[PDB]
mmCIF file of N, CA and C in Angstrom:
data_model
loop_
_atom_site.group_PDB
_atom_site.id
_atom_site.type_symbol
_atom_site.label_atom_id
_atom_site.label_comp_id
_atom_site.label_asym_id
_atom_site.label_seq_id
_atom_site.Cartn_x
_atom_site.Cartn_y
_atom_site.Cartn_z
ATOM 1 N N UNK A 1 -142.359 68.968 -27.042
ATOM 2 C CA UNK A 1 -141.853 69.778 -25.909
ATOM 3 C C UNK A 1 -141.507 68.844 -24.731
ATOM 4 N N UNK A 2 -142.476 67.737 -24.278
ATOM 5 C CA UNK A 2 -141.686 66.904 -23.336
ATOM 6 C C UNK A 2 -140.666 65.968 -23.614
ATOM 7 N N UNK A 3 -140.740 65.603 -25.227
ATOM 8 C CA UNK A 3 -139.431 64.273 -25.184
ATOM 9 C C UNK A 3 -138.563 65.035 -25.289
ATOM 10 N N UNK A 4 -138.261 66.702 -25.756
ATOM 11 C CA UNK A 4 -137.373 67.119 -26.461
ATOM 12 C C UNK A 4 -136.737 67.471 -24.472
ATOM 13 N N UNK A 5 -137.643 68.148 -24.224
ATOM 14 C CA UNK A 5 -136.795 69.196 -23.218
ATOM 15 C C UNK A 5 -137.785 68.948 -21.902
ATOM 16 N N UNK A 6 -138.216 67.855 -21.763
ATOM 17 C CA UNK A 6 -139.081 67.501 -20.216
ATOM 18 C C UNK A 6 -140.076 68.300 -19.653
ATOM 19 N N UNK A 7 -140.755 69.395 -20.778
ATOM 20 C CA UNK A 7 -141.809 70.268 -20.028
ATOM 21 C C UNK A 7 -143.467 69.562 -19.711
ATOM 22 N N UNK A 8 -143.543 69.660 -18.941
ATOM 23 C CA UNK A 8 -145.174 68.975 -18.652
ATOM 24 C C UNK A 8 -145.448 69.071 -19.540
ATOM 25 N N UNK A 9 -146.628 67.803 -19.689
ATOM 26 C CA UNK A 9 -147.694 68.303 -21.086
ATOM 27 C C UNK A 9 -148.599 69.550 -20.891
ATOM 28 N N UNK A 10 -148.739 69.606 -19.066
ATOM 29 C CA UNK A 10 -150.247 70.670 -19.060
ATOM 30 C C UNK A 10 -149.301 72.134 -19.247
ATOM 31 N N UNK A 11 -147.730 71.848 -19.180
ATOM 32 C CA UNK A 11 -147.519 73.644 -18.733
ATOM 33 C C UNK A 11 -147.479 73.641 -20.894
ATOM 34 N N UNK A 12 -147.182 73.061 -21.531
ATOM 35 C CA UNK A 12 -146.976 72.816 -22.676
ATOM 36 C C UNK A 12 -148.118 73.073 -23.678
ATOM 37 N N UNK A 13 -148.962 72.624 -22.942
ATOM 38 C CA UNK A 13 -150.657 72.799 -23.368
ATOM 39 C C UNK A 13 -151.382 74.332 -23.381
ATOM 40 N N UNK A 14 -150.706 74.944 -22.152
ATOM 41 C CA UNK A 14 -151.087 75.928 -21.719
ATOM 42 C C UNK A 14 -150.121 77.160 -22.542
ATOM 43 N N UNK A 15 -149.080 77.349 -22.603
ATOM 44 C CA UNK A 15 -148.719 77.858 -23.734
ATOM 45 C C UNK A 15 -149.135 77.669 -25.109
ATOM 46 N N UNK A 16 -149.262 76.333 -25.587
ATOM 47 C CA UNK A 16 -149.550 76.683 -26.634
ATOM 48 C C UNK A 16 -151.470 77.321 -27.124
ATOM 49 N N UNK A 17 -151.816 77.443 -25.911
ATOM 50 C CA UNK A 17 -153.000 77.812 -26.052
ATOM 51 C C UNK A 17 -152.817 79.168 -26.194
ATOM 52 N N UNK A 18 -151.670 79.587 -24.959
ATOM 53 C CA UNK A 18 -151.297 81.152 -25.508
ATOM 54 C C UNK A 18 -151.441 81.734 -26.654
ATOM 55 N N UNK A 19 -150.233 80.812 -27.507
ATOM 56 C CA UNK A 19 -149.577 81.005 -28.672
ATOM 57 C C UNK A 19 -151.229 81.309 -29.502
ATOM 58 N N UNK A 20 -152.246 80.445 -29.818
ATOM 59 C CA UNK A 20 -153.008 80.744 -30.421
ATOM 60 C C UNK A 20 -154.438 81.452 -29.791
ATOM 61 N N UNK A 21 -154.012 81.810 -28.839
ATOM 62 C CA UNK A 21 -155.085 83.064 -28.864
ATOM 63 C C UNK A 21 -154.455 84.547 -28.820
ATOM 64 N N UNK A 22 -153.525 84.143 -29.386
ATOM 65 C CA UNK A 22 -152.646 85.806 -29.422
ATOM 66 C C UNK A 22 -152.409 86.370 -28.450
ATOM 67 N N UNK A 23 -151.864 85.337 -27.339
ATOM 68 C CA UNK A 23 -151.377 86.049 -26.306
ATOM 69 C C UNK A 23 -149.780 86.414 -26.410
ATOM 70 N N UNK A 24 -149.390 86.984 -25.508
ATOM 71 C CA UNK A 24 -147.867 88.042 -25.458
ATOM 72 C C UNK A 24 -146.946 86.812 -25.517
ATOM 73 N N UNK A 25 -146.018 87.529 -26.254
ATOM 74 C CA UNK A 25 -144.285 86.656 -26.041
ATOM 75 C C UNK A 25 -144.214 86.849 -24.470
ATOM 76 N N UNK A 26 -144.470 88.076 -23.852
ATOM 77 C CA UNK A 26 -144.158 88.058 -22.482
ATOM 78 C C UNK A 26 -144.558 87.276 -22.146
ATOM 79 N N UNK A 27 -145.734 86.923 -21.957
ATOM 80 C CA UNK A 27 -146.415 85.967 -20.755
ATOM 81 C C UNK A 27 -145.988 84.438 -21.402
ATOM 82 N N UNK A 28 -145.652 83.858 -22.662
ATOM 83 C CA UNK A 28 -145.179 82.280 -23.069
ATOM 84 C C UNK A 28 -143.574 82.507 -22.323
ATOM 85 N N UNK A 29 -142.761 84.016 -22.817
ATOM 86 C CA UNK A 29 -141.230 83.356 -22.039
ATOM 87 C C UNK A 29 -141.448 83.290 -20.518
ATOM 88 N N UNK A 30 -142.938 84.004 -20.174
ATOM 89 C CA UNK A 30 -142.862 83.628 -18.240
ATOM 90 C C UNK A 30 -142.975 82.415 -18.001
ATOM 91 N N UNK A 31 -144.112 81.748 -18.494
ATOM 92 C CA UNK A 31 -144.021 80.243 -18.318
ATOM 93 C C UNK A 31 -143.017 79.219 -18.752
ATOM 94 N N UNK A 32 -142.230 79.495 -19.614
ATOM 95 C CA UNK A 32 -141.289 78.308 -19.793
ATOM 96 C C UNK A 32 -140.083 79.094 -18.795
ATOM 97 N N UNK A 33 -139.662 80.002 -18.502
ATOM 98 C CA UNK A 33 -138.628 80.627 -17.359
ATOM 99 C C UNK A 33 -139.078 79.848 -15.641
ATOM 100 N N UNK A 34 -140.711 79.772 -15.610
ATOM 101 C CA UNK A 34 -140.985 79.274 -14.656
ATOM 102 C C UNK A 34 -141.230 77.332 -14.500
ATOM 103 N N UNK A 35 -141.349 77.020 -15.522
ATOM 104 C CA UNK A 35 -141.241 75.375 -15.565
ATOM 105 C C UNK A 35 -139.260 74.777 -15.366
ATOM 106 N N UNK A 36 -138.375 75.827 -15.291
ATOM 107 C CA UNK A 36 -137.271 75.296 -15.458
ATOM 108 C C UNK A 36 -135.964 75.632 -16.343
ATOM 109 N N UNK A 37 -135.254 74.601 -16.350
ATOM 110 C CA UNK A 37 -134.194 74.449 -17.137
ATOM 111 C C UNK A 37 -134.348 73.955 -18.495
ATOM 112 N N UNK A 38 -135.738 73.390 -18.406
ATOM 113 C CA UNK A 38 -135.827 72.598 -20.105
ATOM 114 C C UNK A 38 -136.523 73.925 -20.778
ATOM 115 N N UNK A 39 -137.784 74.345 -20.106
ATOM 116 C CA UNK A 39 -138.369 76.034 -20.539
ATOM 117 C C UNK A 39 -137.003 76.734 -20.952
ATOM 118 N N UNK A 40 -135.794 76.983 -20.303
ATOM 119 C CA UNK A 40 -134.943 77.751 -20.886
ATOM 120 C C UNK A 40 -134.474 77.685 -22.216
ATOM 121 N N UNK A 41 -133.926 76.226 -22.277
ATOM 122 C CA UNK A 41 -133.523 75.375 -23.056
ATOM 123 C C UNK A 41 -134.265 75.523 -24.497
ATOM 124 N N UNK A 42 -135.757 75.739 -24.169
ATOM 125 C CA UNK A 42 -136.390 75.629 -25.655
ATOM 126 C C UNK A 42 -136.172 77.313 -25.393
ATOM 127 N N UNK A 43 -136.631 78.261 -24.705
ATOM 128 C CA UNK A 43 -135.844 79.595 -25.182
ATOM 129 C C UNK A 43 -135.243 80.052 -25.784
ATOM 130 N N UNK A 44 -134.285 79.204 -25.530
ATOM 131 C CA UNK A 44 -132.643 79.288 -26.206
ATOM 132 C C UNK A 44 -132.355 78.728 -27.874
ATOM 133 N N UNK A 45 -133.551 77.715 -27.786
ATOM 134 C CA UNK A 45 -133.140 76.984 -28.972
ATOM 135 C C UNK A 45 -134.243 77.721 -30.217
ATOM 136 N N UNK A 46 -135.004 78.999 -30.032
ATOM 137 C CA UNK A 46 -135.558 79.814 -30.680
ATOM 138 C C UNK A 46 -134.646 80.469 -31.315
ATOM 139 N N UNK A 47 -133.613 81.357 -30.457
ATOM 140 C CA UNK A 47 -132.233 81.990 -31.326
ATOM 141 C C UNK A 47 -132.905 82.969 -31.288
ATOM 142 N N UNK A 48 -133.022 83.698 -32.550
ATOM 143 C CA UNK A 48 -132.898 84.804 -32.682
ATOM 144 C C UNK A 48 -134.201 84.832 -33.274
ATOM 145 N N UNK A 49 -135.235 84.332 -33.489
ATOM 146 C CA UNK A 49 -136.366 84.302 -33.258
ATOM 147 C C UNK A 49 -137.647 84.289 -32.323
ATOM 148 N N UNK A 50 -138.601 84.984 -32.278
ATOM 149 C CA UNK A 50 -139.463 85.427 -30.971
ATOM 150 C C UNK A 50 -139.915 83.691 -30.710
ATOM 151 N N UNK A 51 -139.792 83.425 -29.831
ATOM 152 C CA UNK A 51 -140.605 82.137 -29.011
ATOM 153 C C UNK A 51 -141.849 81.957 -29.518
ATOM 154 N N UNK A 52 -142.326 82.871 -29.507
ATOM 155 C CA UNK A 52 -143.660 82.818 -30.158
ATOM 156 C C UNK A 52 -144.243 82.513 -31.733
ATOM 157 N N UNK A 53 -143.530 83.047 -32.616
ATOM 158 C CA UNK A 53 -143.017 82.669 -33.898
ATOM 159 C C UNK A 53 -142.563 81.749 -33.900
ATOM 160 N N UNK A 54 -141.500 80.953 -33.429
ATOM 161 C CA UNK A 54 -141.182 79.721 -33.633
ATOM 162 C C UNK A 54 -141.968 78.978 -33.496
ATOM 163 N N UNK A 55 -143.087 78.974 -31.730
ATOM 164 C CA UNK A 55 -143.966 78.178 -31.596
ATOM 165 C C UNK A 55 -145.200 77.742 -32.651
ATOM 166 N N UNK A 56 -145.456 79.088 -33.086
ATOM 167 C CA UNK A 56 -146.467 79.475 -34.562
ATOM 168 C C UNK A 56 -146.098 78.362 -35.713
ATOM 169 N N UNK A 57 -144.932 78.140 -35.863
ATOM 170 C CA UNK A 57 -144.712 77.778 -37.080
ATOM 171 C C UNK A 57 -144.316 75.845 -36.631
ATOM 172 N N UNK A 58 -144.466 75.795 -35.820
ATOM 173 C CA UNK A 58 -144.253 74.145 -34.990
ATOM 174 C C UNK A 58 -145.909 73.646 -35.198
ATOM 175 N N UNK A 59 -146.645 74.579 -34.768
ATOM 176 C CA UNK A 59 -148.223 74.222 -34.413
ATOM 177 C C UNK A 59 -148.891 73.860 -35.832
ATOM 178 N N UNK A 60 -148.262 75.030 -37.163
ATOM 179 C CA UNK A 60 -148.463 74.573 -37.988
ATOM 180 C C UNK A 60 -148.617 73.924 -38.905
ATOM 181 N N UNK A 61 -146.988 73.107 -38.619
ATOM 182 C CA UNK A 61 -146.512 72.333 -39.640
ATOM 183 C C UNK A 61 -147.354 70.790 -39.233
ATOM 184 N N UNK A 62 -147.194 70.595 -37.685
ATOM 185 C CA UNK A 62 -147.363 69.560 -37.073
ATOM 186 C C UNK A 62 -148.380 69.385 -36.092
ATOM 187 N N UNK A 63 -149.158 70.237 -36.048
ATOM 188 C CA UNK A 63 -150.757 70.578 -34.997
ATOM 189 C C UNK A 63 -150.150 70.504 -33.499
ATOM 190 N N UNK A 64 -150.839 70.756 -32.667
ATOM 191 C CA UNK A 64 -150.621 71.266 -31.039
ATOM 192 C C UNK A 64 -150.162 69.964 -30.292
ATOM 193 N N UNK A 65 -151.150 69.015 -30.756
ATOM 194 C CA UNK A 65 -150.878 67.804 -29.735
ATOM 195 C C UNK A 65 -149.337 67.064 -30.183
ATOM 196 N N UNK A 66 -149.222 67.031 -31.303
ATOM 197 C CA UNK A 66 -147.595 66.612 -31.873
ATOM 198 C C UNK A 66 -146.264 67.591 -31.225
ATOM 199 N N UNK A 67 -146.412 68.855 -31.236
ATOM 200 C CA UNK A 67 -145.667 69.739 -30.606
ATOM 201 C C UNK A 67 -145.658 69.553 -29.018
ATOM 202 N N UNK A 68 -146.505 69.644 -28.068
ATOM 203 C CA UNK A 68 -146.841 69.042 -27.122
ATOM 204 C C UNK A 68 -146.233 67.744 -27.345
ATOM 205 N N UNK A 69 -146.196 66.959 -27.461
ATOM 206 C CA UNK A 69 -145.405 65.917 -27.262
ATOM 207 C C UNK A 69 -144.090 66.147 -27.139
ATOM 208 N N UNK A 70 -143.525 66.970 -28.326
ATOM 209 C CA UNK A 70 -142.327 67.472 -28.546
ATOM 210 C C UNK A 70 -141.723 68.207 -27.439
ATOM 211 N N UNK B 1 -153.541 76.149 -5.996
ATOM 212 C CA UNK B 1 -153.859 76.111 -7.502
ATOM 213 C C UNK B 1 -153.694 74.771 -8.551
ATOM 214 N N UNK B 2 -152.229 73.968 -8.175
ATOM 215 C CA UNK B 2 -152.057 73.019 -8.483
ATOM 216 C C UNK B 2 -153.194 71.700 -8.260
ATOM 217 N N UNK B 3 -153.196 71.586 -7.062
ATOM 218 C CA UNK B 3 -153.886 70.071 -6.845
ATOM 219 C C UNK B 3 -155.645 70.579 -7.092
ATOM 220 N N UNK B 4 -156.192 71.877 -6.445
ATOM 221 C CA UNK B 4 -157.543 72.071 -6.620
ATOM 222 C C UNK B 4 -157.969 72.400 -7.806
ATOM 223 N N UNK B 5 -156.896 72.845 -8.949
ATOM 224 C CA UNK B 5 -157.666 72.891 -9.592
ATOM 225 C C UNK B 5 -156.795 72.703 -10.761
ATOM 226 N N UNK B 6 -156.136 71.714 -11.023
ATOM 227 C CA UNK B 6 -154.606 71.368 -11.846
ATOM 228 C C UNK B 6 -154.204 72.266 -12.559
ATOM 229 N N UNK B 7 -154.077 73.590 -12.084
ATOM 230 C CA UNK B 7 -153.282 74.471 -12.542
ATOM 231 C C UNK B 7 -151.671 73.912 -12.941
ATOM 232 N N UNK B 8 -150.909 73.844 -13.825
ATOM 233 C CA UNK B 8 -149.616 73.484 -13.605
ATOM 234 C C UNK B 8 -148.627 74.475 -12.804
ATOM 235 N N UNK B 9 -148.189 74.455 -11.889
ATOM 236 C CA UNK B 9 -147.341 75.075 -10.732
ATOM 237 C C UNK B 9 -146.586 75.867 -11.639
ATOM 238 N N UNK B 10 -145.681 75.780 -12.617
ATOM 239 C CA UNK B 10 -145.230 76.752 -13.520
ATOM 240 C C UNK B 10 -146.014 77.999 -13.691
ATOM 241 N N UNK B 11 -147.419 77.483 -14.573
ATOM 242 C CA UNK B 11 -148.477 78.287 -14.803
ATOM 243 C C UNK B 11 -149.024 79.593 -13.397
ATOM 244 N N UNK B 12 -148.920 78.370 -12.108
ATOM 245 C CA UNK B 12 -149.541 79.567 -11.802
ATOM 246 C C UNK B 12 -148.751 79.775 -11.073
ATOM 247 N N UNK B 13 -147.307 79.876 -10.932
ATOM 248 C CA UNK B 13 -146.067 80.987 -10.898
ATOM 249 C C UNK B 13 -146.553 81.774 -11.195
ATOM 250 N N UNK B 14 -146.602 82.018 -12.817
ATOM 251 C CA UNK B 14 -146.682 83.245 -13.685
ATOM 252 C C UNK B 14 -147.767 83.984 -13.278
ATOM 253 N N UNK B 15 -148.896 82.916 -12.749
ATOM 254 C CA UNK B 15 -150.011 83.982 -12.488
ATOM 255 C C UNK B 15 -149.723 84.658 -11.567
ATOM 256 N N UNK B 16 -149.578 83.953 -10.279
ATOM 257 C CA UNK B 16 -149.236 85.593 -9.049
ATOM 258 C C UNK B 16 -147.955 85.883 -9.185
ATOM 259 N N UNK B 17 -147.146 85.785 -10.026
ATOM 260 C CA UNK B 17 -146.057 87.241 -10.600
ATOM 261 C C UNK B 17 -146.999 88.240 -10.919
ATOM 262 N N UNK B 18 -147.772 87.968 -11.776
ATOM 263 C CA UNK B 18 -148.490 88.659 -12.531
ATOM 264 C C UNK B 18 -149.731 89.537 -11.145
ATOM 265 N N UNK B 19 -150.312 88.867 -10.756
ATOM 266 C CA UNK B 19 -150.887 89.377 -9.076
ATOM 267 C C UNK B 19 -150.250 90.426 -8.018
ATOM 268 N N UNK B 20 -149.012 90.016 -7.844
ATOM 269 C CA UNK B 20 -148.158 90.714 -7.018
ATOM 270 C C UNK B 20 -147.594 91.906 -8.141
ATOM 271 N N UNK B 21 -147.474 91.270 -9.326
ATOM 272 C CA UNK B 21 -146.838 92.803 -9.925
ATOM 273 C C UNK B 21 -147.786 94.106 -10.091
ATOM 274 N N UNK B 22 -149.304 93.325 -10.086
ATOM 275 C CA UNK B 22 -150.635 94.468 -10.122
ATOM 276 C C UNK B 22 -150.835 94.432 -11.754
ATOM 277 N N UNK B 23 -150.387 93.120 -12.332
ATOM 278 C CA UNK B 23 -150.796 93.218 -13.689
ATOM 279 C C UNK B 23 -152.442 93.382 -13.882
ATOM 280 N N UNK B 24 -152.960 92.672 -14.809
ATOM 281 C CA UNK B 24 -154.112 93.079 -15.271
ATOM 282 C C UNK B 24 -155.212 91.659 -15.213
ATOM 283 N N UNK B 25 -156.740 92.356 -14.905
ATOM 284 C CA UNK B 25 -157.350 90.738 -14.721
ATOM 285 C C UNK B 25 -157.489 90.309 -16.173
ATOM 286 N N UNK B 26 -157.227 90.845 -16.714
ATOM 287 C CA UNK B 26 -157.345 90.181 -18.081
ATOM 288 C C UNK B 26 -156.688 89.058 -18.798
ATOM 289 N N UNK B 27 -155.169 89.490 -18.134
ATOM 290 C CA UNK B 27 -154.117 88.824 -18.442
ATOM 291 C C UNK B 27 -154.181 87.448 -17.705
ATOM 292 N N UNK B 28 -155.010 88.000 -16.422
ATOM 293 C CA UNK B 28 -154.812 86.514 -15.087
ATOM 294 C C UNK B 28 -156.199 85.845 -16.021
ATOM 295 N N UNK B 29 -157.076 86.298 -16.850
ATOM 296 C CA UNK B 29 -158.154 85.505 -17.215
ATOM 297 C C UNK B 29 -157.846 84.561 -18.451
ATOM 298 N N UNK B 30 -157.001 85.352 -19.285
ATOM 299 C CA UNK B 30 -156.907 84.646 -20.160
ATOM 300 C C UNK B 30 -155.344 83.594 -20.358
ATOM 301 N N UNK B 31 -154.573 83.815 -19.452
ATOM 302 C CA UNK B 31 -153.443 82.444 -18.817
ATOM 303 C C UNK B 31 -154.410 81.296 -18.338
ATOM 304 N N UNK B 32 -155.268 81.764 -17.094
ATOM 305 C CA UNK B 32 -155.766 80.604 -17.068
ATOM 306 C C UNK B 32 -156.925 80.257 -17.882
ATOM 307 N N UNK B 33 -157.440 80.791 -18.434
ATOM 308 C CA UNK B 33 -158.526 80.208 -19.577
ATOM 309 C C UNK B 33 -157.176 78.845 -20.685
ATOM 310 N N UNK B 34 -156.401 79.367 -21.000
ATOM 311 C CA UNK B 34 -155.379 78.724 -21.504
ATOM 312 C C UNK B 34 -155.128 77.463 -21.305
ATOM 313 N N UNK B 35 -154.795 77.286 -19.357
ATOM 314 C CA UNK B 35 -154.620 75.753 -19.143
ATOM 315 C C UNK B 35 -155.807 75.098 -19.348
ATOM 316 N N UNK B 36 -156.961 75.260 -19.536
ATOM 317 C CA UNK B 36 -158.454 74.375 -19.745
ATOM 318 C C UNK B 36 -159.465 74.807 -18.881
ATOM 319 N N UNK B 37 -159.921 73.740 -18.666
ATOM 320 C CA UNK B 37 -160.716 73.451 -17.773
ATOM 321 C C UNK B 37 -161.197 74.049 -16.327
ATOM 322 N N UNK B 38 -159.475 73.520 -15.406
ATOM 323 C CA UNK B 38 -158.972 73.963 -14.413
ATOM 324 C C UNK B 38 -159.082 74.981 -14.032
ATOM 325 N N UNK B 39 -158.763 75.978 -14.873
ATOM 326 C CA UNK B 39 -158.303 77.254 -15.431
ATOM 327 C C UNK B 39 -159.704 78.334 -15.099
ATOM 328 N N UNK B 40 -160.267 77.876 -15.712
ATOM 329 C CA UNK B 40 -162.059 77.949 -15.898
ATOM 330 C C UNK B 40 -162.690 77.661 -14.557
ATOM 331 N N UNK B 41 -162.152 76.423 -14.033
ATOM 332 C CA UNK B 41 -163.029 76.270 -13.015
ATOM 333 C C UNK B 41 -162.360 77.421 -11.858
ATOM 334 N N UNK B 42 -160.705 78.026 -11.339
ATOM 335 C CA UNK B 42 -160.440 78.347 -10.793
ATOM 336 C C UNK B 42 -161.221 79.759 -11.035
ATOM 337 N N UNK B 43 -161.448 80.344 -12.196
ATOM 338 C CA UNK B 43 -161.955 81.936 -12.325
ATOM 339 C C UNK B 43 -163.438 81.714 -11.675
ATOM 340 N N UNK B 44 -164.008 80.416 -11.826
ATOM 341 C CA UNK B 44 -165.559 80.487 -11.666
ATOM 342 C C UNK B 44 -165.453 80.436 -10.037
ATOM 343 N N UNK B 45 -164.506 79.960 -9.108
ATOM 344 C CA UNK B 45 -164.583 79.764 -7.744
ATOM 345 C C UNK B 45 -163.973 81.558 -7.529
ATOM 346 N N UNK B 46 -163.655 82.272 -7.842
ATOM 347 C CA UNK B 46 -163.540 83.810 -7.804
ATOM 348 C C UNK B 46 -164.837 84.721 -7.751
ATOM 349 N N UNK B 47 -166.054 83.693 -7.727
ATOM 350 C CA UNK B 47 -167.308 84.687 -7.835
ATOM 351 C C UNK B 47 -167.339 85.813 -8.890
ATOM 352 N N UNK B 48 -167.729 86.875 -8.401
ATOM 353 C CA UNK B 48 -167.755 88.309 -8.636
ATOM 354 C C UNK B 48 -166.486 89.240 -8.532
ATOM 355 N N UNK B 49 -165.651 88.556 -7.585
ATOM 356 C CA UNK B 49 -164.502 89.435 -7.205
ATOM 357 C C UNK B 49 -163.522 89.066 -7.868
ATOM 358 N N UNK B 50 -162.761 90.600 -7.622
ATOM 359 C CA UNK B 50 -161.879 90.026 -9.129
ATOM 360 C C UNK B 50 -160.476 88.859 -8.951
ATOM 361 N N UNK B 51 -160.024 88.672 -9.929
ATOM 362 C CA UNK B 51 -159.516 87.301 -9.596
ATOM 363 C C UNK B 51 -157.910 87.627 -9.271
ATOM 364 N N UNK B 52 -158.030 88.855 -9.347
ATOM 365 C CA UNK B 52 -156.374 89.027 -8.964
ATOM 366 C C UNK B 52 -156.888 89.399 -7.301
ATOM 367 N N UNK B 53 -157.689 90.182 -6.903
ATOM 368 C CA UNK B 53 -158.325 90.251 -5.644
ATOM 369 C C UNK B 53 -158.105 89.484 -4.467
ATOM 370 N N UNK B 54 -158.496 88.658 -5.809
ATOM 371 C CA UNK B 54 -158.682 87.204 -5.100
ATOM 372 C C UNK B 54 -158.117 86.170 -4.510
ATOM 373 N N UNK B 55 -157.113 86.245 -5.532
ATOM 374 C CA UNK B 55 -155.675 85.403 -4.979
ATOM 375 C C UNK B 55 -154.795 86.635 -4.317
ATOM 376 N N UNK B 56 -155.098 87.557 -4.185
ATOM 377 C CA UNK B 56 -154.196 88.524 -3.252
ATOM 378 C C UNK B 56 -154.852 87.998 -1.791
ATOM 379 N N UNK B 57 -155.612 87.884 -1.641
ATOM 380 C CA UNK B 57 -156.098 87.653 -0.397
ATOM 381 C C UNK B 57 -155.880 85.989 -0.126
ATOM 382 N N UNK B 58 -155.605 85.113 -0.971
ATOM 383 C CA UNK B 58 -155.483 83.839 -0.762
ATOM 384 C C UNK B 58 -154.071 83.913 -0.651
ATOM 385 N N UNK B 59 -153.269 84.723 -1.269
ATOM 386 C CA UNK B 59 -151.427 84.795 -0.685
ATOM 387 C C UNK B 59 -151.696 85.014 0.638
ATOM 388 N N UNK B 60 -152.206 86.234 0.839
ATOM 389 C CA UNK B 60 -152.471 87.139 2.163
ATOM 390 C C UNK B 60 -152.449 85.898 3.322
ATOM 391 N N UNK B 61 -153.818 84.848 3.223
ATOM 392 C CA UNK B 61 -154.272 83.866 4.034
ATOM 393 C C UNK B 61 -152.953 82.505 4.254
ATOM 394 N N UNK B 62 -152.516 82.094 3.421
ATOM 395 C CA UNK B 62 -151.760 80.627 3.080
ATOM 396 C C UNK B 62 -150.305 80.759 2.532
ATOM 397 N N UNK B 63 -149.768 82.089 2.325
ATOM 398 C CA UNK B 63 -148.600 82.401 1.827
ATOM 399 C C UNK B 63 -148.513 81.463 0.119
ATOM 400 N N UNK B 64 -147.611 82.207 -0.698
ATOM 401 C CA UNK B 64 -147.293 82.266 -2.214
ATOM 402 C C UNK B 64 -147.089 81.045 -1.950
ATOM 403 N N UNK B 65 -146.420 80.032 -1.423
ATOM 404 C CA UNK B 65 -145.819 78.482 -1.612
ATOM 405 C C UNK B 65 -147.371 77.519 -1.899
ATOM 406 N N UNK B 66 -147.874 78.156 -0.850
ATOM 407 C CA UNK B 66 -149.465 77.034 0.051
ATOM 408 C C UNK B 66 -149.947 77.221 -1.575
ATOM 409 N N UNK B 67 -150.620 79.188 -1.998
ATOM 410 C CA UNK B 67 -151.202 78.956 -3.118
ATOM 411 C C UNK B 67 -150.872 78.445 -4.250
ATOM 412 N N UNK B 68 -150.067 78.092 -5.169
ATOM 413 C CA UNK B 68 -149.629 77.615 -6.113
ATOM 414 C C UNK B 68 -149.516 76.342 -5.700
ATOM 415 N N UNK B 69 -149.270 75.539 -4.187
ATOM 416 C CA UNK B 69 -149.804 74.201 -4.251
ATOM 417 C C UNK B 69 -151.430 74.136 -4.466
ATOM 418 N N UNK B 70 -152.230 74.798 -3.944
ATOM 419 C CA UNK B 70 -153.520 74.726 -3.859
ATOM 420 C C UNK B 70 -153.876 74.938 -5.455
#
């Protein structure tokens, strides 16, 4: 999330903590809407898939701290 | 929120959106349980009162800019 699209590690961290305690798509698209233009950016690059699902399946393949980086 | 208690400024955007909209303390507990530590330590400086309360009255005192630096 930061090499790709410049989001802090902590706002990055903090979503994905969302993501696995089953918190809302609402409240992960508030925080990346509120970090910026790169938050949009990975928005956008979900498509037509929930943010949240995408994030799900990033954490999985590649664990939190690798995505976070990302 | 930021410097006292490294909330990431994104993060706690979302939280007093979430404050001012009259969302839920649940929601403000478990965003910041999310960022760590910080997060944790900011609910534990909320005492007893509730934590949307709480930062309503800390907008009230320092205006939305001051809190999310704090």
């Amino acid at each position: 999330m930061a090499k790709e699209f410049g989001i802090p590690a902590a706002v990055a961290k903090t979503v994905l903590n969302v993501v696995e305690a089953g918190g809302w798509v609402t409240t992960i698209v508030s925080i990346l809407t509120a970090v910026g233009s790169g938050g949009k950016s990975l928005l956008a690059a979900a498509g037509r898939e929930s943010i949240k699902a995408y994030l799900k399946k990033e954490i999985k393949k590649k664990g939190k701290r690798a995505v976070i980086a990302w």
